[PDB]
Design a protein around this ligand. Sequence first.
Ligand code: TRT
Lengths: 303, 140, 49, 123, 124
Amino acid sequence: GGGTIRFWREKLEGYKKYHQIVKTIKMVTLAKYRQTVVRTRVRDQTLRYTRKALDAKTQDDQEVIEKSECLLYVPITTNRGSCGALNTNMVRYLQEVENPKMTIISVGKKALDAMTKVFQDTYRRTILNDMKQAMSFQFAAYVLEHMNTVPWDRAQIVYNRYHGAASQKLAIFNLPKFEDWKQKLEEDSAGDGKIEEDGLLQSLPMKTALGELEETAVEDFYNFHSCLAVLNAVSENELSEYAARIVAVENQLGNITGLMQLADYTYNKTRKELITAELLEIIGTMTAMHAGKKVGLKKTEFW
Amino acid sequence: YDDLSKQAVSYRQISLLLRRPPGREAYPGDVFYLHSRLLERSAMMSPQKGSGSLTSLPIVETLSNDVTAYIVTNVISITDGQIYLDAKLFTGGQRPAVNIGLSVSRVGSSAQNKAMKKVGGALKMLMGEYRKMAGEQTSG
Amino acid sequence: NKVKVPGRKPQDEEDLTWAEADRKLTPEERYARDKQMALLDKMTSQVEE
Amino acid sequence: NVAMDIVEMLTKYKELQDIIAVLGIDELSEEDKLIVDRARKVAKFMSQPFAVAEVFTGMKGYYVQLEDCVSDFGSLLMGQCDNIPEMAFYMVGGLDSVKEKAAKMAAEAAAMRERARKAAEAK
Amino acid sequence: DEAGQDVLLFVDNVFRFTQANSEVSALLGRIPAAVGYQPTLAEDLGMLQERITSTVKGSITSVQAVYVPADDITDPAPATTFSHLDATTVLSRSVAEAGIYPAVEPLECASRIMDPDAIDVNHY
Ligand SMILES: COCCOCCOCCOc1ccc(C(C)(C)CC(C)(C)C)cc1
């Protein structure tokens, strides 16, 4: 019985050390989250003309695949785990959307081991920002320079949108190709302004004034707004990571607690049972010695 | 019987004061027979014997919600069912604190009224679904 | 196409792991082997130079 | 051989349960979570209803034949049935019953979706 | 009885009361049943506690300290003491360091008369 109680004691100490370690992770992530939440007050304003430029009606997939030749899907994953279902849900969405003409350039280490085992050939590489220095416009420029290795016809930038501390949903930016964007710009600048989808904005004057703009400046307009889109995606996934890690750490601490209470109950149970066992042993050996005493008179002469 | 867990302590006093050979968890070893003599007397008698009845609702005190105690298993090994009340649900406002998963009636389906039998089948399906749908999400 | 999970069966991939070996010390061993290989390569260069 | 492979899979699943209960399934490699889903399907499949327990399981009892038991576990071992969900294996006998239960569950889930659509439209 | 009035009975740790009776039972030669507590734990404790009851002629309330050995509630001495208790005034150094005095932590405390069948409905 000594081995059992020693084992349970070692498991108790292991769970306690594991608990304080996870608590330390929680404190670090809390510091980073309290930094990054300052962005939440200030976001939701920079991409509005980008929307107006790049957004289109919801195009069904199966027509986009036949229309296109080499799509692109950029999943923005994390550098380290204990996040939750963000990475797994991104992978699930892509294996839901998997089609013969795709190519995946990701962002994060966790897109490196997972996707390559699900997507053998479509997955190409990834991009890694060691988050010592906050993301930048030139990080998104790096990502654009990586995406442009392909002659892609559409780029679906997947990311996690931080609706709240308990709400980190998925989100997509469907970026067109430059030549296709320019052709659609002309074809929609000619005709009158009529929205074809609720929630979408008319931008015919913008699609004329861009025609007033020279060619190199329009290419710069496209690249600049796509860069801002990528940057908003990276920032939102950073915040979503740091917000979902807290949830996926407090639940770990709850599980660790429960394991610790079970370990404590079993340790104390084994302790008491061992005490009773040693007691009954001693009383048994003593009782046997008492039983080995005769009741005979053993009479002898006293004179 | 409120409660058989204390009857066993009294018999443990009687035995250890007589220096009888103890057993698991300090009990002599005949405490199973002690409760079985009592619980087997509770029966539904045959029409040959009057078709009478003697129901028994014994009570037993667990420790930190541990059904793996000696007396608890000794009584579950005798009784025709189990009603497991949980301190967690009791402190959580649910009163009676019956845990349906850890509870069962091995025989009462034959006695249950049909009007109650149908409602019980429906609620059993509903709660078997509810126990899973509540845990599978884990606040996801 | 989904995944090449390892196993005991030939269509499955190699399972080079050993149940006897512990997983707790694995990261320390990985770091140690990486550092040792880097030092050995640097010694190769330093011996030639 | 099927039995030995099943036992090996469950052994690995027992070792992985120590991590699953603490961290979660998401922190496992893709191979490990596939092994987990498969061993969960195996364990759920091992349950079957009996005619004696009809009062409790609320299901008619099955008599799974020996020859049909090995082919089912082997198909579940070779990855021949991974699109089936996990709960389809719970309290059934034979892979044919598993596919019937999966059809029932898919039909019910769809029907719930169309019902929710009708309610939202009428709402 | 004679004066016809309520009484408080303050008891330093009942753990030591149980320990003394256990030592007596051991010296008398009686087999320790469990961890080392006397077989007559419940009887010897009830012979005291049952005297601590309300009466037509008066009442004896008793406030009793309890040392839990190794913070295990399942130990037989706490396990038997708790069965007789009706309320728990838990105290905490946390609230005391926060300036609160008396240092009661109401959430982890509890009572048995918290029922409208006993007290008025508004209090409950
Ligand atoms: C519904 O009415 C209930 C009335 O209960 C009155 C008796 O209260 C019993 C108190 O039970 C406990 C249980 C655990 C504990 C802990 C574990 C918190 C004590 C500790 C911290 C000293 C180890 C304290 C008291």
